[PDB]
Design a binder for this molecule. Sequence first.
Ligand code: SF4
Ligand code: CA
Lengths: 50, 216, 410, 148, 191
Amino acid sequence: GLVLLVAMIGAIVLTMRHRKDVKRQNVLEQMWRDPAKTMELKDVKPGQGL
Amino acid sequence: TDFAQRRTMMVDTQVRPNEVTSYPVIEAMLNVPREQFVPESRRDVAYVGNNIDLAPGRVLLEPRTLGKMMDILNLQNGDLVLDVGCGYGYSAAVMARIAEAVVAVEEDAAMAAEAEGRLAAQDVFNVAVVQGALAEGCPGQAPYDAILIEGAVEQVPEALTEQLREGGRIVALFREGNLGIVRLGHKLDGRVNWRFAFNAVAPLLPGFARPRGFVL
Amino acid sequence: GDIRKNSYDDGSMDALTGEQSIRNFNINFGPQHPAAHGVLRMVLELDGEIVERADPHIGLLHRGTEKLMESRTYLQNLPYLDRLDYVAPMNQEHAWCLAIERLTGTVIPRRASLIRVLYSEIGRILNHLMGVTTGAMDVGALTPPLWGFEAREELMIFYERACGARLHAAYFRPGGVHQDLPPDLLDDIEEWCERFPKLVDDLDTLLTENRIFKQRLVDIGIVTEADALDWGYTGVMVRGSGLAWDLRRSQPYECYDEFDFQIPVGRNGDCYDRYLCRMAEMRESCKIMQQAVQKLRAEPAGDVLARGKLTPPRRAEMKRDMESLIHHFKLYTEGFKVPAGEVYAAVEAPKGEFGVYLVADGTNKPWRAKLRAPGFAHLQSIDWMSRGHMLADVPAIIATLDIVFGEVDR
Amino acid sequence: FLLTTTEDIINWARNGSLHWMTFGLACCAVEMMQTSMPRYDLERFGTAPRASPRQSDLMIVAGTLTNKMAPALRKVYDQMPEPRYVISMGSCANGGGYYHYSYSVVRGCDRIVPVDIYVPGCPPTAEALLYGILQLQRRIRRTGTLVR
Amino acid sequence: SDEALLELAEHIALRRENDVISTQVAFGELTVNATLSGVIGLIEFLRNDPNCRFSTLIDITAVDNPARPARFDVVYHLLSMYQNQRIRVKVQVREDELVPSLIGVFPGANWYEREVFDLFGILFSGHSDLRRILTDYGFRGHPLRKDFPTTGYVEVRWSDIEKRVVYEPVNLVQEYRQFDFLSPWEGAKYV
Ligand code: SF4
Ligand SMILES: [Ca+2]
């Protein structure tokens, strides 16, 4: 078990790195997105812009 | 101007997607500055996907045409290449990065002198610019492994195709009215046999027109 | 805004990254590709399936519509509009009619105005059903398109019963609409409107709170207000980011003022928000269809075309009265003349702002007809939008932009 | 007899398992899609879509073929294993249609690939296309052999 | 909106006197004719100025006028969602004259200028990626010029000899028919 642990530590110590320039999503935050909160209907009067 | 970004974009979007796979050609086109080989007034449009006008009736071919033209010649490190109508020498500089040596023939003393100056300023040393009529070629240094004609022709004179080595390749753009066909020729048993390569257009070179007289 | 040279959180620089990039992973994404709509050749540069460059090659459906329009009369050019954003053809016809009506200073009858609103909202549902359910198919959901396209089938039958064609109606005309609607057709549209919200619930039950659907759309293709202004975004592409801009309200046309509907907007401006906005818009369009049918029934009988010097007479008059026969003969051969001038007439098409820039010169044919497709501006931004995402996200991003290439290429 | 009844079995299998490439060019593709939707359910005939030409027996040219697109259509047709059948759907593919006199349009897809059936309309209705597919099946039954 | 557009046109003419040649309000739309040398500066002012906040580029196109010394018009359509107004900017361009690129202001101008270059042959200076966008690869000519034929010059066919799709000169089984319906009577303009 310790021989296998040393392999776990070594592989991560030697090689781990992450691109910091790509787009990432937090899966739990994706699943928490509430449709009721993220979309809403607006009463826009005629002739009215932003 | 960031000509490096424009050069990379030209190769990515005008050369790679047009069936140009030869990496020597892609490497060469990514490195030879196109704007250094155009008249000063055309410098900002050096990387546009069109023929650049050099002199009346003479152009610097569009990047797609040249990329595909060089890709099918399939140049080797030991090749001696004849570049007919080199203009300011852009095409010769690109081929010089692949072939052993290039003999660039230009007919306008103004462009031939500018080609020498610009070729030297880019430290290109396996390109000799020879001044004379395009239809004659340069028979002094013949035979050549490959011949590239950098403008539309109606016929390629026998004198020009005799300077081609047996097994040599010649690529020319043929003009039939509004239609332009790039053909690839192979010298076999002394005869150059032409085959369709792809469709592209350019103005006719002076001296390559065909004999056209009265027909009832 | 350039990720081709990988940047790592440990600052490492690989030996190969030092060399100039000559041998890159380039792949043709389309034209023959289920997610490419048949005529998109997008060249993708991938790095471990990360999209580092997207280079859309378009024009594979360029047919020279704007050149062909210059040798035809204004009436002969009306069917060309059907075939641009061909998922909802009458909505595109509307811009052409509005431009001609503005230059000629023509007022269309009240009933024609109500019918135009009615069938414009049918087109919006026709488009949003296609967009939402084929967008679901792009992220692997097989069933939603089958349910949605059954409802589309019913709406295409309403098209055919109005004009005799399921898709390319040629129904909106300069001066109104070609023909009046049968009374039994209005009954059937009302009956369909009562069922439609049930399908929207069923699609919502299948997709909206599915965890897989959320993980394929939430925080994908995020658009900020500043991004919208870079790339000429219109329609749901701006509303998904929270800008309550809708041409039917900001720059009203036809009789939209007197209808009751709301503008859905998103808060995060991602693919999930734009999906919710389109689902909500489908509900709003159904309500408009219900109001329009009620107004049409409450209307007094009237004509659907302005007649006069702009449109042909009725066939019975044409066969009886000398003036009508002349106007029929002339308007079907020469057509009306449009006074010299230039206008840009825009509508809130289902895919965004669609406009016609019409240069008239006093003759019976347009001098120049420039067609402004919302998808042209939306597709141009795919390189910026897709940079940094994975290859699996590309079909979702193509879906969220709502591209039809009849209008991108023209 | 043996050989004719063998061809009948081959024609029966090929008609009952006619897989078409996922390939739609323009607004004819909208009606082609409706043909596979619940009202008509093209797949109930065994006529199912296939994304890859290597698994396709049938190409439906559904939309305008431009000059820029013509090489791509020819390529994927060339990559269909044999037998391969082609249906020309709609005016543009049949003869150029509304864009016949354009500078950028192929005046009929039979200038690029051989065609088995022409379906008229602009667009043909979903039912008209379904009729055209069944006419192709009659043609195969009438003339089908092991070659095609 | 007519008084509003005339007031807005004076504001632009005043603040950008040298850019603006003239303004017009016709059919409820404001058009600004600008010099070629000042078009980028003017469009930048229109984008950023408080009174006129034209932060959406609707499109760029060209119009061909062969009877005119400067045959081309380049037309910029801009929308303001915040002010809720539209404007058109027109510049006259001679054949072979270069037009400064708008991509510095609007990244989305990139494709519109490619389309103008493709269909009219107008080159833009300062363009990062200027190549044909709608016509076939290696297309000869600019189809939206009034002197380019509708059917063009060449057509494609699959050649069994070359095993390629090749170009050939156009041959029409039925020649294009161009009916001339226009009447010799203009009609009256009654007062
Ligand atoms: S034939 Fe008609 S419906 Fe079919 S693609 Fe052509 S224009 Fe569209
Ligand atoms: Ca990389």
